[PDB]
Amino acid sequence: HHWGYGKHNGPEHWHKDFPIAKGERQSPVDIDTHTAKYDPSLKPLSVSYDQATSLRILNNGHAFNVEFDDSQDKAVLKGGPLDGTYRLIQFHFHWGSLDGQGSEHTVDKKKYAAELHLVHWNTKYGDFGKAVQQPDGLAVLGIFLKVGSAKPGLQKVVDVLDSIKTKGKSADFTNFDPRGLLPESLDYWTYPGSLTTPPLLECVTWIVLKEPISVSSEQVLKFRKLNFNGEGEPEELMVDNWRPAQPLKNRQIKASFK
Numbered sequence: 001h002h003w004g005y006g007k008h009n010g011p012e013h014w015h016k017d018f019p020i021a022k023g024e025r026q027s028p029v030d031i032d033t034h035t036a037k038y039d040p041s042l043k044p045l046s047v048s049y050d051q052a053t054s055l056r057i058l059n060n061g062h063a064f065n066v067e068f069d070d071s072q073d074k075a076v077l078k079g080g081p082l083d084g085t086y087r088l089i090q091f092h093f094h095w096g097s098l099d100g101q102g103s104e105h106t107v108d109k110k111k112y113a114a115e116l117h118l119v120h121w122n123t124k125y126g127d128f129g130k131a132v133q134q135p136d137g138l139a140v141l142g143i144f145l146k147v148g149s150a151k152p153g154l155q156k157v158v159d160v161l162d163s164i165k166t167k168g169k170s171a172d173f174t175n176f177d178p179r180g181l182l183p184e185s186l187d188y189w190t191y192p193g194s195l196t197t198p199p200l201l202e203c204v205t206w207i208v209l210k211e212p213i214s215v216s217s218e219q220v221l222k223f224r225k226l227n228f229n230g231e232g233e234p235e236e237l238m239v240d241n242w243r244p245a246q247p248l249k250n251r252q253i254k255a256s257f258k
């Protein structure tokens with residue numbers, strides 16, 4: 001009886017195995033655009049993905065993760081609210097059964113069709129497992145997806161999903177360029193928070209881009225053909241793999257833009 005996104009094991013149950021689920025800095029949150037304050041002291045974010053080395057794509061039973069070589073400073077996130085250098089380890093998405101839900105963060109209670117998370121770790125802690133034990137260990141770049149025009153830079157991801165339908169399947173996924181998943185603007189909101197999956201560790205500086213990317217209906221329909229189950233098991237479509245907004249508590253969301 002492991003955690004997941006069903007009736008019996010979904011987000012309202014997680015606190016029993018992971019009591020931090022009711023903690024002081026949980027994610028995701030609703031971004032109230034009228035209460036977020038412009039912070040002129042933040043910087044421009046620096047997203048340096050030209051040397052990124054993707055390796056593999058894995059269906060982990062929750063989402064699919066595109067994994068990178070993080071054994072050197074190749075694809076790194078710096079600036080904005082961050083001090084130091086954060087290495088890209090993996091990206092994944094959260095999405096819905098229908099276009100009106102899927103994102104984890106919300107904007108004035110608006111749900112997007114999906115949300116991309118680019119997960120990076122703070123090199124001062126040496127490895128990812130040490131970083132997730134620190135309050136400043138991870139930086140997650142979050143990007144909303146709306147349904148409209150296709151995202152050309154996403155199609156290589158879409159076209160490999162048939163090969164990783166079920167939990168525990170992986171495929172070679174070399175030479176994928178994550179720059180093709182970014183919107184034009186790097187305007188963002190930021191706040192201190194958590195992993196949105198168990199173990200829900202309070203180790204994340206969240207950086208959520210204001211500008212969504214557009215993907216096609218055909219692209220997101222291919223996300224919804226994945227399976228939470230392993231091969232040969234009763235089919236459970238991989239949909240609605242999002243945690244809902246959590247209480248903001250004693251936190252301020254800051255804006256990089258006026």
Ligand SMILES: C=CCN1CCC[C@@H]1CNC(=O)c1cc(S(N)(=O)=O)cc(OC)c1OC
Pocket residue numbers: 060062063064065092117119128129132140194195196197198199
């Ligand atoms: C070294 C320990 C930390 N490990 C322990 C098992 C998962 C946890 C790592 N969690 C993540 O990387 C992880 C984080 C997120 S999220 N939405 O960025 O918090 C999602 C995910 O899979 C959809 C993840 O699993 C790979």
Ligand SMILES: [Zn+2]
Pocket residue numbers: 092093094117196
């Ligand atoms: Zn995520």
